[PDB]
Amino acid sequence: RPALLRLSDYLLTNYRKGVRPVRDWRKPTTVSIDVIVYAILNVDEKNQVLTTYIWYRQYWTDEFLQWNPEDFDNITKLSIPTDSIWVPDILINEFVDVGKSPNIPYVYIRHQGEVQNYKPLQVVTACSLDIYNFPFDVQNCSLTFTSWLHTIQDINISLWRLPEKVKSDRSVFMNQGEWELLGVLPYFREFSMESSNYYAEMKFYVVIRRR
Amino acid sequence: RPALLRLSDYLLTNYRKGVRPVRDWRKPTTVSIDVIVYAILNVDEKNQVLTTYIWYRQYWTDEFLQWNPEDFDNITKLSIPTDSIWVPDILINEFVDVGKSPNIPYVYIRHQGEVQNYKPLQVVTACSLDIYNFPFDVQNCSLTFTSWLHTIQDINISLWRLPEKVKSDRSVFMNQGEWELLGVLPYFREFSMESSNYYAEMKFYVVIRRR
Amino acid sequence: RPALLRLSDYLLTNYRKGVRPVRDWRKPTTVSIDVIVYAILNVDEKNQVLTTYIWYRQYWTDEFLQWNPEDFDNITKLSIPTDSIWVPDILINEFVDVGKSPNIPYVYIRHQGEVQNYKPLQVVTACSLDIYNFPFDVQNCSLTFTSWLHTIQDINISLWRLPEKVKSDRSVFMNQGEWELLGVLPYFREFSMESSNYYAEMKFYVVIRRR
Amino acid sequence: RPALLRLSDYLLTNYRKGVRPVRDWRKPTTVSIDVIVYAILNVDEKNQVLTTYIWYRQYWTDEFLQWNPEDFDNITKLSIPTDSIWVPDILINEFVDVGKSPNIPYVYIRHQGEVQNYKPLQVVTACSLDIYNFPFDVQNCSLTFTSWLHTIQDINISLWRLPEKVKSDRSVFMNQGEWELLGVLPYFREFSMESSNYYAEMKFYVVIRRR
Amino acid sequence: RPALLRLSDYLLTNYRKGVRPVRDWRKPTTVSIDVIVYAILNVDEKNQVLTTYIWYRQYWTDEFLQWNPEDFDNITKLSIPTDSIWVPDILINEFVDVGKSPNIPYVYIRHQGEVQNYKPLQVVTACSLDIYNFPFDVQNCSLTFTSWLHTIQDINISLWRLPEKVKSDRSVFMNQGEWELLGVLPYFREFSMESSNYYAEMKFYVVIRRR
Ligand SMILES: *[C@@H]1O[C@H](CO)[C@@H](O[C@@H]2O[C@H](CO)[C@@H](O)[C@H](O)[C@H]2NC(C)=O)[C@H](O)[C@H]1NC(C)=O
Ligand SMILES: *[C@@H]1O[C@H](CO)[C@@H](O[C@@H]2O[C@H](CO)[C@@H](O)[C@H](O)[C@H]2NC(C)=O)[C@H](O)[C@H]1NC(C)=O
Ligand SMILES: *[C@@H]1O[C@H](CO)[C@@H](O[C@@H]2O[C@H](CO)[C@@H](O)[C@H](O)[C@H]2NC(C)=O)[C@H](O)[C@H]1NC(C)=O
Ligand SMILES: *[C@@H]1O[C@H](CO)[C@@H](O[C@@H]2O[C@H](CO)[C@@H](O)[C@H](O)[C@H]2NC(C)=O)[C@H](O)[C@H]1NC(C)=O
Ligand SMILES: *[C@@H]1O[C@H](CO)[C@@H](O[C@@H]2O[C@H](CO)[C@@H](O)[C@H](O)[C@H]2NC(C)=O)[C@H](O)[C@H]1NC(C)=O
Ligand SMILES: *[C@@H]1O[C@H](CO)[C@@H](O[C@@H]2O[C@H](CO)[C@@H](O)[C@H](O)[C@H]2NC(C)=O)[C@H](O)[C@H]1NC(C)=O
Ligand SMILES: *[C@@H]1O[C@H](CO)[C@@H](O[C@@H]2O[C@H](CO)[C@@H](O)[C@H](O)[C@H]2NC(C)=O)[C@H](O)[C@H]1NC(C)=O
Ligand SMILES: *[C@@H]1O[C@H](CO)[C@@H](O[C@@H]2O[C@H](CO)[C@@H](O)[C@H](O)[C@H]2NC(C)=O)[C@H](O)[C@H]1NC(C)=O
Ligand SMILES: *[C@@H]1O[C@H](CO)[C@@H](O[C@@H]2O[C@H](CO)[C@@H](O)[C@H](O)[C@H]2NC(C)=O)[C@H](O)[C@H]1NC(C)=O
Ligand SMILES: *[C@@H]1O[C@H](CO)[C@@H](O[C@@H]2O[C@H](CO)[C@@H](O)[C@H](O)[C@H]2NC(C)=O)[C@H](O)[C@H]1NC(C)=O
Ligand SMILES: Cc1ccc(Sc2ccccc2N2CCNCC2)c(C)c1
Ligand SMILES: Cc1ccc(Sc2ccccc2N2CCNCC2)c(C)c1
Ligand SMILES: Cc1ccc(Sc2ccccc2N2CCNCC2)c(C)c1
Ligand SMILES: Cc1ccc(Sc2ccccc2N2CCNCC2)c(C)c1
Ligand SMILES: Cc1ccc(Sc2ccccc2N2CCNCC2)c(C)c1
Ligand SMILES: *[C@@H]1O[C@H](CO)[C@@H](O)[C@H](O)[C@H]1NC(C)=O
Ligand SMILES: *[C@@H]1O[C@H](CO)[C@@H](O)[C@H](O)[C@H]1NC(C)=O
Ligand SMILES: *[C@@H]1O[C@H](CO)[C@@H](O)[C@H](O)[C@H]1NC(C)=O
Ligand SMILES: *[C@@H]1O[C@H](CO)[C@@H](O)[C@H](O)[C@H]1NC(C)=O
Ligand SMILES: *[C@@H]1O[C@H](CO)[C@@H](O)[C@H](O)[C@H]1NC(C)=O
């Protein structure tokens, strides 16, 4: 048997996707996320919505999906379908349409249990857009990523990279459109409405000025 | 075996989603629902429809999905996929398009059998919108949630929170659009057209005035 | 074991959805349908199409899905997923878009074998719409429901209610739009193009006048 | 056991849908197709596309799905789900959008192995549309049906009816729109770009003149 | 048993789609791709996007899906569903909408392990489109195909045909629209942002001038 088949069987023959992947339920499943803005397709002042094509990547630890490489021909990482494992319900609020985003089939996994998921997002978000300074307008829209259902005690959200590095990330931006990206400011806040439930969310402020 | 895996197996290995989850068929499955209006994307007087992005949550009791925590490492609640259990067919009438709403994978469950489902709704509804007072127009549109098929003897709908608390809920509303939310008035009515079938529905009146 | 679980197992453990549910293949599967017009969202004279939100219900007999209540705690009816049983391919011709209609998960079943399916339809249909009498225009569009594939010898279509009762049904119509419903006239005709195939269809004429 | 259940089991318990249904791989799977134009919803000169609602039917031979009627209560034909058998990948080129077409669940089968599939098509096609003779314009758009992947040695396309009968078929056309159908001219051609691959396609020229 | 059934069983009874199909994980899975532009449906200068209907074909080697023909009635190639095997996640960046593309069910396979996949693409891409020379405008938009997740060490992209042959390929182009195709220039580049990850992508520049 090839090493990849042996590893895939050893991992997925005694694993189910319904549960949260932690040996002890008392610890939360920390999730690290990163956001890169690839392009700004449209900014609609009439409907007060804008469309952003952002490259979204996140990683977390699956305490069940771990192995010793030396028993599997020194395989340090491998790719398996995303639908065959647990995936956090980290969803972006303020959204109005996300069907344009295709579902990426595969995700990378490492022998430590770390799971890496790279996916695109064609999300269109609703935010306040004033046209007061139309000729030299500058807008401030926010993207907030949160565990839609799980509380902070179950899922927590952190940053993959340092805040300053992602704040001035224009490496892959399409810098030929009507809008110019000035920065992507992250922000962490604990969101709570009930007297006992606290939810963790990460706000990304996309700052753009017209040209 | 970890406690979560043992509990998930003990629950879902002797459970099927086709049936209504009640030990005795003679009792109805009471469902408690709540509605929070997150934003009002569009109000179309031409087509007599308006779009509301509302945060919808509901809970009910699954008399099969109950356990004693002390036998499962004091696990009081856990999350499992929504497609692995019975879910009431509580659908909103007056609707014209609901495909924009994504399907939330997971739902929370407690050892008492209570099931909590949090989902978003991008429903666009058809209702009478007069433009008689255009400059200072005030509109009155209604959202009615009902068990589409099940009668009152099978599914009944109630309110999660007290009517007054939800009537003046502007905690998460996007209060920067063209429309301002004045209140969300609930109302319970037994709907019957045949001589023997009674259906329970809950009407939510979204009161909005232009600005 | 609870009665519902026992009944569901007894029914679906020896049943498959591919076949037409009849003990003898020589008899047709009579289907009774009813149509209620809930609203008329749009009437497009430019594209010669109109959109109707109609509440559609139908029932038929599954000769396999029958039981004696006294052996199942006097259960006279129960609900199971619609995808777990055979469903007739009764489709509406003249259609141009039906994706807006959501798929109802559950259907009601009775111990006699009768299956009741209640579903909504957001169908937009193409029909001749003249604007000759624009100010006082009256239109005559038709909805025809037919077994798309099965012939009359396999599937036949009938009326749930008497023709006169459905002809003057304005009980749930949204009587506040630009159009007023005058009647819904049914009509049964055997449709045949080949020399040996006869298909049964039921035409519903929606009569509307502007206001 | 009822005859239908016995036949369905005998057929589908030793059958899989992945393969091409032929006892000997050396023979092609001849497919006969027919096209009936039900209506012409739109003809867009701006985008150089037109929408045609055509009734599409095809049949082919499944050498595995054959039986002797006398052993199954003289059952000469039966209907089973289309997703439970092999279906040719006969797709229409020049297309721009086909999502509007619903998926028909069932297909008819005969004891000889013949499979009959009736499905609708809401295809919108891109073709050259000149507006030179606008007031009395006549257009010539083409629909070509081909085995998208399989070569002629695997799948071949033929005509269900004689070319002249389908060429003057206006039996079910909606002859009340802006366009009038003059004919549907078929044409068979072997399409080859590589030095060894030949693909069979059938071109249907829809001839229409404005009125 | 027919040869096709025996071969399909022998192949798919000891094969799973999750893993990358290579006997040794240390070697990359080279993928050869080709692009043919069938038509240019729309070029939107307002939204800075254009729609291209391109015929996309690719092939790769599955080291598990190989056999000796002489043991299977000299079967040199056969077709099986695309969802039953591993398929590379070769996705086109700069995209804005790909849902219009239908999913081709079957793919061709040869006894050497080679897998051939032919699929259409209705991708709409975002690229800089200047209207400076409107009357005689010439545009330069790019399509880049990359392994979205897998690095170069896992998936690599090459050209099926020689660069010059694909650069002047107008064999199946719809040369009757507003735009004329001047060439499709390929280009290979190793894309890397992290200090250790290198991804292989192939850029196709579609050169078009108005007429
Ligand atoms: C959830 O994650 C956030 C972000 O990683 C945590 O907030 C940080 O916690 C560390 C350690 O307590 C502090 O040094 C930082 O100042 C906090 N803020 C940020 C922005 O890093 C938070 O403590 C985590 N909570 C739980 C329950 O895991
Ligand atoms: C866009 O909005 C964000 C959030 O309100 C602004 O970020 C804050 O700016 C204030 C300015 O005094 C700082 O004190 C905060 O520390 C910032 N917060 C974060 C998380 O960075 C941002 O400045 C706004 N941009 C523009 C151009 O107005
Ligand atoms: C279905 O639920 C509704 C709402 O919970 C019930 O209506 C209430 O019933 C209680 C007790 O009978 C009354 O005190 C309230 O005044 C009723 N109205 C409201 C708005 O709470 C109804 O009785 C339930 N019916 C069934 C069959 O369960
Ligand atoms: C919007 O419509 C609702 C329902 O018709 C109104 O709510 C009712 O208002 C009347 C006013 O006399 C009260 O007597 C009822 O008790 C109310 N019913 C409920 C369930 O609250 C509401 O007032 C309307 N709003 C506006 C601004 O006209
Ligand atoms: C298919 O159903 C239709 C409608 O139920 C049948 O047509 C009726 O048949 C009865 C009895 O023969 C007549 O009394 C009615 O006048 C017919 N028309 C209507 C509108 O009810 C038809 O006979 C059925 N055919 C088959 C083969 O079952
Ligand atoms: C709309 O069209 C239907 C069908 O053509 C009309 O219904 C027929 O009307 C004629 C009038 O003489 C009657 O003789 C038929 O018996 C009717 N058929 C049915 C099935 O009811 C209807 O009258 C038309 N409505 C309008 C307003 O013109
Ligand atoms: C594929 O099918 C086409 C159409 O049925 C075949 O073309 C016909 O072949 C017959 C017999 O050779 C001729 O008499 C006709 O003149 C041909 N044309 C038409 C329009 O019928 C073709 O031979 C078939 N090829 C294969 C390999 O099966
Ligand atoms: C539409 O185009 C088709 C295909 O080019 C035409 O059909 C051909 O017409 C020529 C006229 O001399 C004949 O010689 C061919 O035999 C026809 N081919 C087929 C397959 O029928 C058709 O005439 C065109 N229609 C119009 C109105 O121009
Ligand atoms: C990935 O594939 C590309 C293209 O096939 C390779 O690049 C070529 O490599 C060959 C041999 O090293 C050179 O002769 C060519 O000049 C290269 N460029 C092109 C455009 O062909 C690349 O080496 C491959 N890399 C890996 C790791 O497999
Ligand atoms: C469109 O853009 C491509 C890429 O920038 C151009 O292709 C390059 O053109 C330069 C011209 O000096 C050559 O030196 C490069 O070798 C070309 N690269 C490739 C990969 O072919 C192309 O010329 C542009 N077309 C137009 C009309 O401007
Ligand atoms: C009173 C109150 C309680 C809770 C909430 S929150 C919420 C409500 C419904 C559906 C989903 C949510 N969310 C939970 C955490 N993830 C984001 C959405 C509110 C608004 C009021
Ligand atoms: C005469 C009559 C009987 C019943 C109804 S109701 C209905 C009809 C068709 C499809 C669905 C329904 N519903 C049932 C309960 N849930 C909401 C929809 C009518 C209108 C007339
Ligand atoms: C000559 C001829 C034969 C049959 C028909 S019918 C048809 C054709 C193709 C696809 C579907 C159908 N239908 C069958 C019954 N259900 C409605 C649609 C025609 C038009 C001509
Ligand atoms: C050089 C060359 C070779 C083959 C083709 S064909 C093609 C190409 C890609 C994807 C699909 C196809 N098709 C095959 C048969 N069915 C219709 C589409 C071309 C254009 C050039
Ligand atoms: C700092 C940095 C690191 C990696 C990338 S890449 C990327 C990021 C998120 C999601 C997907 C990707 N991709 C990987 C390879 N395939 C194309 C997309 C960037 C932009 C910055
Ligand atoms: C795996 O790695 C260890 C440490 O580098 C080495 O000793 C061993 O030979 C390797 N085994 C294989 C099969 O590569
Ligand atoms: C569970 O809770 C009970 C009561 O608080 C306690 O006695 C017991 O030790 C707990 N068990 C575990 C495993 O935490
Ligand atoms: C079922 O109904 C019959 C007739 O009414 C009655 O005699 C019997 O006791 C009932 N059984 C149960 C369990 O309700
Ligand atoms: C089947 O048909 C044959 C020939 O017509 C006849 O002899 C036989 O009795 C039939 N059997 C049944 C069960 O109808
Ligand atoms: C397969 O091909 C070989 C070589 O051409 C030939 O000897 C053999 O007879 C063939 N077998 C069949 C079954 O065609």
Side-chain angles (χ1 to χ4, degrees), chain B residues 111-177:
Chain B
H111 70 283
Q112 304 290 20
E114 191 164 31
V115 180
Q116 299 197 356
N117 187 8
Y118 299 68
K119 54 193 281 213
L121 290 173
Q122 313 264 311
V123 66
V124 317
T125 56
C127 51
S128 86
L129 310 174
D130 65 346
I131 200 161
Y132 188 78
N133 294 293
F134 167 66
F136 304 81
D137 186 12
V138 57
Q139 300 292 357
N140 205 341
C141 191
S142 65
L143 318 167
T144 169
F145 295 89
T146 166
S147 47
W148 177 259
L149 175 50
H150 291 96
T151 64
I152 195 159
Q153 298 192 343
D154 281 87
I155 292 179
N156 191 8
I157 302 182
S158 311
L159 269 191
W160 197 326
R161 291 178 297 160
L162 286 304
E164 65 274 13
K165 263 169 44 199
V166 62
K167 184 182 321 313
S168 61
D169 202 88
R170 278 166 257 104
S171 66
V172 83
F173 190 94
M174 253 159 173
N175 251 357
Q176 283 303 10

Side-chain angles (χ1 to χ4, degrees), chain C residues 165-183:
Chain C
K165 263 169 44 199
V166 62
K167 184 182 321 313
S168 61
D169 202 88
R170 278 166 256 104
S171 66
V172 83
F173 190 94
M174 253 159 173
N175 251 357
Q176 283 303 10
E178 180 178 355
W179 298 91
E180 179 161 312
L181 208 87
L182 300 163

Side-chain angles (χ1 to χ4, degrees), chain A residues 146-148 191 193-194 199, chain B residues 36 55-57 118 161 172:
Chain A
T146 166
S147 47
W148 177 259
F191 172 93
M193 289 301 127
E194 301 216 349
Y199 309 88
Chain B
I36 300 92
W55 280 2
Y56 177 90
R57 61 182 185 155
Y118 299 68
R161 291 178 297 160
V172 83

Side-chain angles (χ1 to χ4, degrees), chain B residues 25 87 96 126 148 150 154 194, chain C residues 57 73 79 106 108 118 122:
Chain B
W25 74 270
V87 178
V96 176
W148 177 259
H150 291 96
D154 281 87
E194 301 216 349
Chain C
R57 61 182 185 155
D73 181 52
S79 60
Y106 314 84
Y108 259 130
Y118 299 68
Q122 313 264 311

Side-chain angles (χ1 to χ4, degrees), chain B residues 72-118:
Chain B
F72 291 100
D73 181 52
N74 285 338
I75 289 166
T76 51
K77 77 195 294 179
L78 87 168
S79 60
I80 59 173
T82 191
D83 70 42
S84 270
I85 56 194
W86 183 86
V87 178
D89 55 88
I90 279 163
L91 200 45
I92 176 174
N93 314 339
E94 303 147 1
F95 78 94
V96 176
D97 181 9
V98 295
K100 285 222 272 203
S101 317
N103 303 118
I104 299 303
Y106 314 84
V107 303
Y108 259 130
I109 296 166
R110 197 169 336 287
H111 70 283
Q112 304 290 20
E114 191 164 31
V115 180
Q116 299 197 356
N117 187 8
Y118 299 68

Side-chain angles (χ1 to χ4, degrees), chain C residues 47-135:
Chain C
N47 296 301
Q48 287 280 335
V49 307
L50 59 84
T51 300
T52 45
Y53 171 27
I54 74 168
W55 280 2
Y56 177 90
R57 61 182 185 155
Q58 63 180 336
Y59 74 76
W60 68 91
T61 293
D62 271 32
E63 312 216 0
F64 307 149
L65 275 168
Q66 71 185 258
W67 70 89
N68 70 341
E70 42 185 40
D71 209 18
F72 291 100
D73 181 52
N74 285 338
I75 289 166
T76 51
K77 77 195 294 179
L78 87 168
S79 60
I80 59 173
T82 191
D83 70 42
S84 270
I85 56 194
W86 183 86
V87 178
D89 55 88
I90 279 163
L91 200 45
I92 176 174
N93 314 339
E94 303 147 1
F95 78 94
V96 176
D97 181 9
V98 295
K100 285 222 272 203
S101 317
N103 303 118
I104 299 303
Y106 314 84
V107 303
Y108 259 130
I109 296 166
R110 197 169 336 287
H111 70 283
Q112 304 290 20
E114 191 164 31
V115 180
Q116 299 197 356
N117 187 8
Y118 299 68
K119 54 193 281 213
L121 290 173
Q122 313 264 311
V123 66
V124 317
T125 56
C127 50
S128 86
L129 310 174
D130 65 346
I131 200 161
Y132 188 78
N133 294 293
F134 167 66

Side-chain angles (χ1 to χ4, degrees), chain E residues 32-188:
Chain E
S32 309
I33 63 164
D34 199 29
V35 168
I36 300 92
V37 186
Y38 191 89
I40 311 196
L41 310 178
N42 179 21
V43 183
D44 196 350
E45 301 87 349
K46 178 62 174 181
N47 296 301
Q48 287 280 335
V49 307
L50 59 84
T51 300
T52 45
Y53 171 27
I54 74 168
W55 280 2
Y56 177 90
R57 61 182 185 155
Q58 63 180 336
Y59 74 76
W60 68 91
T61 293
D62 271 32
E63 312 216 0
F64 307 149
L65 275 168
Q66 71 185 258
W67 70 89
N68 70 341
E70 42 185 40
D71 209 18
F72 291 100
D73 181 52
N74 285 338
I75 289 166
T76 51
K77 77 195 294 179
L78 87 168
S79 60
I80 59 173
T82 191
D83 70 42
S84 270
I85 56 194
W86 183 86
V87 178
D89 55 88
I90 279 163
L91 200 45
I92 176 174
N93 314 339
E94 303 147 1
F95 78 94
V96 176
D97 181 9
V98 295
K100 285 222 272 203
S101 317
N103 303 118
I104 299 303
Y106 314 84
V107 303
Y108 259 130
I109 296 166
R110 197 169 336 287
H111 70 283
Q112 304 290 20
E114 191 164 31
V115 180
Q116 299 197 356
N117 187 8
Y118 299 68
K119 54 193 281 213
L121 290 173
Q122 313 264 311
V123 66
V124 317
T125 56
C127 50
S128 86
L129 310 174
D130 65 347
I131 200 161
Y132 188 78
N133 294 293
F134 167 66
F136 304 81
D137 186 11
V138 57
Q139 300 292 357
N140 205 341
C141 191
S142 65
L143 318 167
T144 169
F145 295 89
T146 166
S147 47
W148 177 259
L149 175 50
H150 291 96
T151 64
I152 195 159
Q153 298 192 343
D154 281 87
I155 292 179
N156 191 8
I157 302 182
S158 311
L159 269 191
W160 197 326
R161 291 178 297 160
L162 286 304
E164 65 274 13
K165 263 169 44 199
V166 62
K167 184 182 321 313
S168 61
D169 202 88
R170 278 166 257 104
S171 66
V172 83
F173 190 94
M174 253 159 173
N175 251 357
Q176 283 303 10
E178 180 178 355
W179 298 91
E180 179 161 312
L181 208 86
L182 300 163
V184 190
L185 298 91
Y187 179 59
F188 172 81

